[PDB]
Amino acid sequence: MGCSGSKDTTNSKDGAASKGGKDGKTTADRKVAWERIRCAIPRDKDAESKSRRIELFKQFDTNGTGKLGFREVLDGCYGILKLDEFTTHLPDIVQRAFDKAKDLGNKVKGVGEEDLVEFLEFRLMLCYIYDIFELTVMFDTMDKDGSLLLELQEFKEALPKLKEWGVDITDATTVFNEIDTNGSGVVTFDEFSCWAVTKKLQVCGDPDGEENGANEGNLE
Fold first, then answer.
1. CA atoms within 13 A of residue 203's CA, in its CB half-sphere
2. EF-hand domain location, by residue?
């Protein structure tokens, strides 16, 4: 049934490998890029953050609307921020960030269900990315090399280390089962991290822009 494909390479019933064209990349390259990015992407709504926040916003909002969606946002970075260089295939990274952000936005407070992102939900979105990056770069090292899976091993080591990150999974084993959904025996970065980033977001989602963090001072 047809004959004109000649011959080519072959493989077995599995191929957890990739080919970028004799490129190559590891913590080294991932470290320098994430270093410039991390520096660009805010993480504490500081003076430099507030400004940038408005800058990048006016960017995607070059159409004049104030109500952006996902598709428009995706291409925005995918074409401007160009996060591909560092992370291989990140159209999904922003996808999950845009979705959750919007939803998680109302839940806490209440502004009505919609589908677009506002200056507020936008701030939460960026946070998702920034965090998701810290993890990947923080796991690849405490984990294996050409791998992206997690196991009870890095779990007990990351459980504590994670606590420092900013979140507090408290109960571990119980969570390992929750985040899990394939029923195999392990969890992938994007999954384990999702639980982290999100949490760190619901806890640090506190609208600062003011002065009311630590206590005022000593009493007696």
1. 12
2. 48-83, 84-119, 130-165, 167-202
Instruction: Give the whole-angstrom CA distance, residue 135 versus residue 148.
Output: 11
Would the annotation count 87 as a binding residue? Answer: no
Output DSSP code: residue 84. T
- Domain 1-220: CATH superfamily is EF-hand (1.10.238.10)
Q: Is 154 annotated as a binding residue?
A: yes
Q: Is 8 annotated as a binding residue?
A: no
Query: Experimentally, how was this structure solved?
Result: NMR
The two tokens of residue 202 are: 């619901």
- C-alpha 199/C-alpha 74 separation (Å) is 23
Q: How far is CA 66 from CA 46, 61, 180, in A?
A: 22, 6, 37
67 is in an annotated binding site: yes
Q: What percent of the chain is helix, strand and coil (3-state, nearest 5)?
A: 55, 5, 45
Q: Can you give the residue ranges of every domain in the chain? A: 1-220
